[PDB]
Design an enzyme around this catalytic site. Structure first.
Site, PDB file in Angstrom:
ATOM      1  N   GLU A  18       0.792  -1.261   0.000  1.00 28.17           N
ATOM      2  CA  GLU A  18       0.000   0.000   0.000  1.00 28.17           C
ATOM      3  C   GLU A  18       0.837   1.332   0.000  1.00 28.17           C
ATOM      4  O   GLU A  18       0.598   2.249   0.791  1.00 28.17           O
ATOM      5  CB  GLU A  18      -1.140   0.007   1.072  1.00 28.17           C
ATOM      6  CG  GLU A  18      -2.225  -1.048   0.930  1.00 28.17           C
ATOM      7  CD  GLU A  18      -3.378  -0.700   0.010  1.00 28.17           C
ATOM      8  OE1 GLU A  18      -3.252   0.266  -0.782  1.00 28.17           O
ATOM      9  OE2 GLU A  18      -4.411  -1.406   0.072  1.00 28.17           O
ATOM     10  N   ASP A  19       1.807   1.416  -0.912  1.00 33.56           N
ATOM     11  CA  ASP A  19       2.697   2.561  -1.072  1.00 33.56           C
ATOM     12  C   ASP A  19       3.844   2.658  -0.042  1.00 33.56           C
ATOM     13  O   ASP A  19       4.333   3.740   0.296  1.00 33.56           O
ATOM     14  CB  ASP A  19       1.932   3.859  -1.333  1.00 33.56           C
ATOM     15  CG  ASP A  19       1.210   3.858  -2.673  1.00 33.56           C
ATOM     16  OD1 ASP A  19       1.880   3.613  -3.716  1.00 33.56           O
ATOM     17  OD2 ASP A  19      -0.019   4.127  -2.688  1.00 33.56           O
ATOM     18  N   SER A  20       4.295   1.486   0.424  1.00 29.73           N
ATOM     19  CA  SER A  20       5.437   1.343   1.302  1.00 29.73           C
ATOM     20  C   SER A  20       6.578   0.820   0.426  1.00 29.73           C
ATOM     21  O   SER A  20       6.330   0.372  -0.705  1.00 29.73           O
ATOM     22  CB  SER A  20       5.126   0.347   2.409  1.00 29.73           C
ATOM     23  OG  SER A  20       5.159   0.981   3.674  1.00 29.73           O
TER      24      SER A  20
END
Ligand SMILES: [Zn+2]
Ligand SMILES: [Zn+2]
Ligand SMILES: [Zn+2]
EC number: 2.7.7.6
Lengths: 49, 266, 65, 46, 48, 114
Positions: free
Chosen positions: A3-5
């Protein structure tokens, strides 16, 4: 890295990857007004203060 | 001997190319890991700064100093400071390097790892000498001074492993490959039209026999025969990266055996 | 802003190869590709280290302070 | 080498008290910088 | 007597004193600019 | 600022023991050893070697969280075989494998030139 990590190479980080400098300046002046009484820079001690 | 087998293809001052036969995948990988992280080396891990009238900031310089390679030949005969009985550091647990540099010339003065000077009593051990491989014999550009520029600093180099900081890394990258033909089907080649045409063949393909399409898949086949290449930074000689690798691994296996012995009483 | 000692990715000492890189380009009138190769920077993580380096230290040194 | 202030313009090694004003003694630039402590800083080379 | 007007370092922040400027203003006022330097290493939730 | 010290990866804590041998509740002749201040370097190697023993019914390791350096090792063996003896043997074989590798590499290295 979901999730956008993202995952980072701690080994690269050690070697200097993406390392930054950070400077911050603090400012002060001796008083604004008072023809006799003026603010002063000094290391303060007791003196009733 | 009897167990895992070696075939050293190429050998240099900074590179070993070898073939590891009669080994399980786990062992090759574990030894690869240990070479990367768990081998002790000596690196700068304290910088006392007296003067730094340079372009660069104290800690930026300090950072580079840790990365500077240092002779770690006789590293096993130097204590970890944490174990040393001294209050702080001493000759048994550390090496002290000094650096004094001043811009004499009008022309930009350069600072090298050669410009570092041991002050500690080395007590005859091959330790703390900064690693120079530079043809011109300078090794590592620490800093650049102009004119009135001065840099006066002391530094204590201590024993450590890459696990705590990569600056103690005794090796660079380690090449590792098994089954260059994918006879094991341990990978699934992504393609557009043809896997063989689209994927570049490995250097190590000439070391194994090709598959032969008119044959079924080998199910009982196992991961055994590894094409490894160990690269040294220069802190320790190549053989030692692999010998100390082998050792450090067995050393920490032995501690487990030992721990079972210890808890077996009270 | 100085050639980093060691390649972030693999750790190979790159800090000793800068001057030498600049000489191969100027003196030996070589191209970056062959120059990097002549300095034994074989893996792309190492090639990027030097190839992409901006040596700002020089511009900084230009100030008198 | 007992320092107080350095001229920001000419690098002059000055030394002055509150009731003696700012400005450089033979340079006359009204700047001024503090000069590094003799305390001496330690750094982990990490 | 006196009253404090001293300027503490940013509560959360910490580093080393870099440069300290002591100068006069347009109206002859003693004024200072204090620079603090910190190396910021790429930590856990840092944005890229 | 909330990052732990790097020695915490290998230096044992206060009290902290290297191995802790707990008995498995869900299966007979099974056990769970918790190895403190260790990773996939030891983890894999020990598990892999346990699988080579024809008396080892089950063997597996896991590191419940990356932050912490510690792995759990489940071992189930046949009746009349202590998993502690299974782990002992496993380690012993591993050293003898490395012992050979060490002398073998050395032997080749001395036959090499440059
Ligand atoms: Zn000591
Ligand atoms: Zn690299
Ligand atoms: Zn002046």
């Amino acid at each position: 890295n979901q999730e956008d990590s993202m995952i980072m190479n701690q080994s690269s980080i050690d070697r200097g990857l993406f390392r930054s400098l950070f400077f911050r300046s603090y400012m002060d002046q001796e008083k604004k007004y008072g023809m006799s009484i003026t603010e002063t820079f000094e290391k303060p001690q007791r003196t009733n203060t | 001997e009897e167990g895992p087998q070696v075939k050293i293809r190429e050998a240099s001052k900074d590179n070993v190319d070898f073939i590891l036969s009669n080994v399980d995948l786990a062992m090759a990988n574990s030894l690869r890991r240990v070479m990367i992280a768990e081998i002790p080396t000596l690196a700068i891990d304290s910088v006392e700064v007296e003067t730094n009238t340079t372009v660069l900031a104290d800690e930026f310089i300090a950072h580079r100093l840790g990365l500077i390679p240092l002779q770690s030949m006789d590293i096993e005969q130097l204590e970890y400071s944490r174990d040393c009985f001294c209050e702080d550091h001493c000759d048994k647990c550390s090496v002290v390097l000094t650096l004094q540099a001043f811009g004499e010339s009008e022309s930009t003065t350069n600072v090298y790892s050669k410009d570092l000077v041991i002050v500690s009593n080395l007590m005859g051990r091959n330790i703390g000498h900064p690693i120079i491989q530079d043809k011109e014999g300078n090794g590592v550009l620490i800093c650049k001074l102009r004119k009135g520029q001065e840099l006066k600093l002391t530094c204590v180099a201590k024993k450590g492993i890459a696990k705590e900081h990569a600056k103690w890394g005794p090796a660079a990258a380690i090449e590792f490959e098994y089954d260059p033909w994918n006879k094991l089907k341990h990978t699934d080649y992504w393609y557009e039209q043809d896997s063989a045409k689209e994927w570049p063949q490995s250097k190590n393909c000439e070391y194994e026999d090709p598959p032969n399409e008119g044959d079924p898949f080998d199910y009982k086949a196992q991961a055994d025969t590894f094409y490894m290449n160990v690269e040294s930074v220069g802190s320790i000689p190549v053989d030692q990266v692999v010998v100390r690798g082998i050792d450090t691994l067995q050393k920490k296996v032995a501690s487990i055996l030992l721990a079972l012995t210890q808890m077996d009483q009270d | 802003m100085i050639v980093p000692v060691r390649c972030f990715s693999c750790g190979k000492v790159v800090g000793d190869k800068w001057e030498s890189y600049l000489n191969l380009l100027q003196e030996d009138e070589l191209d970056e590709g062959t120059a990097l190769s002549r300095l034994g920077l074989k893996r792309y993580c190492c090639r990027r280290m030097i190839l992409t380096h901006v040596d700002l230290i020089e511009k900084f040194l230009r100030y008198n302070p | 080498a007992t320092l107080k202030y350095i001229c920001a313009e000419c690098s002059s090694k000055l030394s002055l008290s509150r009731t003696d004003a700012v400005r450089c003694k033979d340079c006359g630039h009204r700047i001024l910088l503090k000069a590094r402590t003799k305390r001496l800083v330690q750094f982990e080379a990490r | 007597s006196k009253r404090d007007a001293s300027t503490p370092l940013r509560s959360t922040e910490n580093g080393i004193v870099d440069q300290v400027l002591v100068t006069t203003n347009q109206d002859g006022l003693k004024f200072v600019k204090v620079r603090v330097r910190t190396t910021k290493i790429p930590q856990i939730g840092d944005k890229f | 600022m909330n990052a732990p010290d790097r020695f915490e990866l290998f230096l044992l804590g206060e009290g902290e023991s290297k191995l802790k041998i707990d008995p498995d509740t869900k299966a007979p002749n099974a056990v769970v050893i918790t190895f403190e201040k260790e990773d996939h370097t030891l983890g894999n190697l020990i598990r892999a070697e346990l699988l080579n023993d024809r008396k080892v019914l089950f063997a597996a390791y896991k590191v419940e969280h990356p932050f912490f350096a510690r792995f759990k090792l489940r071992i189930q063996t046949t009746e009349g075989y202590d998993p502690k003896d299974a782990l002992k043997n496993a380690c012993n074989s591993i050293i003898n494998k490395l012992g050979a590798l060490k002398t073998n590499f050395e032997t080749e290295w001395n036959l090499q030139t440059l």
